[PDB]
Design a protein around this ligand. Structure first.
Ligand SMILES: *[C@@H]1O[C@H](CO)[C@@H](O)[C@H](O)[C@H]1NC(C)=O
Ligand SMILES: [Ca+2]
Lengths: 164, 82, 59, 82
């Protein structure tokens, strides 16, 4: 990145580490977690660090486990202003077939609703934990291989560990 | 933001005065606006935008009842939320 | 009835965060979802917005 | 002291709906079938909501009311059908 480092150093990306030896960084190729990101009006980021935009108004499928069926996430888009080029996220629906085949729903506030029932946070069930983060944003955590973020005003995130 | 004098003719928009009342002609783009002394906006507009335009002065079609089609496209009965 | 407790004056209405506010920034609770005081909002067929506490829907 | 025995919780049971089991906790909290719940809770018959935002109020049908069991001041309202 346009600056010099002595030999033997070990700078670390978020993903892994690299060490200087004979003017050539040696680097590991071990996987590191991805992050699909919804934000703004309609701006998506794939797990593979692709960026794009799709201003559709329906219930779209954001993510899903597709060899087995440990979960499935479903975004719900609506127009969000006077203009037609303004399509923000209103809610997201999560589905856990591992526990009751339940159906979590993150609402346009910081609210959550399991199977129609509004819920006070925290929600320690067996696997999934739902709690506030700054007391202004919800955070789902199923197991140790799944996280989420607030879908109040539309800034959904995910954290998928390399087991997926 | 820079106040200019009058008349003025930049970019194909002649900003003149006619009959003591101010005019803004855009014949290349197909419109003639003007204002009077009391203040009464007027917009003469060509037939090239037949069925095309939509705004606060409605679409240029033949009918007069459907010309509240919102920025989404919605025939609204109210002349106000439109 | 005519109950006894902690209220705030008639120009101010109660917000979720303990403070009470005028009806300008009083959110809407359409379908349970808490919408902000200005949220234009629509599927293909319906058209809805939140003005001052109430959710003005149309079709 | 030994002459100090206050109420901690109360448990309600409605065989008309799922044979459920409501529980009013030592705060202003409620817990249906183990699940904590945000108020209000409009199910079909029973409504649970705050009163002054410091006290819960159950209302099953039109023949049953309750009051807060946080620090122990339970009430009931039974209509003459009982
Ligand atoms: C206006 O345009 C629409 C869409 O192309 C077309 O369906 C309709 O026939 C047009 N009407 C007139 C009056 O030209
Ligand atoms: Ca017309």
């Amino acid at each position: 990145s346009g600056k010099r480092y002595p030999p033997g150093t070990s700078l670390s990306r978020d993903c892994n580490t690299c060490i200087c030896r004979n003017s050539q960084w040696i680097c590991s190729n071990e996987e590191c977690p991805g992050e699909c990101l919804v934000t703004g009006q309609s701006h998506f980021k794939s797990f593979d660090n692709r960026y794009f935009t799709f201003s559709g108004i329906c219930q779209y499928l954001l993510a899903r486990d597709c060899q087995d069926h440990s979960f499935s996430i479903v975004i719900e888009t609506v127009q969000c202003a006077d203009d037609r080029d303004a399509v923000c996220t209103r809610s997201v629906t999560v589905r856990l077939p591992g526990l009751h085949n339940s159906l979590v729903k993150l609402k346009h506030g910081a609210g959550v609703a399991m199977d129609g029932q509004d819920v006070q946070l925290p929600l320690l069930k067996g696997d999934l934990r739902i709690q506030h983060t700054v007391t202004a944003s919800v955070r789902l955590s199923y197991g140790e291989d799944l996280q989420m973020d607030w879908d109040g005003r539309g800034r959904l995130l995910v954290k998928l560990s390399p087991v997926y | 933001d820079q106040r200019v004098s009058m008349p003025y003719a930049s970019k194909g928009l002649y900003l003149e005065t006619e009959a003591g009342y101010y005019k803004l002609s855009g014949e290349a783009y197909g419109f003639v606006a003007r204002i009077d002394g009391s203040g009464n906006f007027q917009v003469l507009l060509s037939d090239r935008y037949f069925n095309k335009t939509c705004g606060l002065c409605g679409n240029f079609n033949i009918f007069a009842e459907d010309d509240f089609m919102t920025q989404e496209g919605t025939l609204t009965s109210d002349p106000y939320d439109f | 009835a005519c109950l006894e407790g902690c209220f705030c004056p008639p120009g101010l209405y109660m917000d979720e965060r303990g403070d009470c506010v005028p009806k300008a920034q009083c959110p809407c609770y359409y379908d349970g979802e808490i919408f902000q005081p200005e949220d234009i909002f629509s599927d293909h067929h319906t058209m809805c917005y939140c003005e001052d506490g109430f959710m003005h829907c149309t079709m």
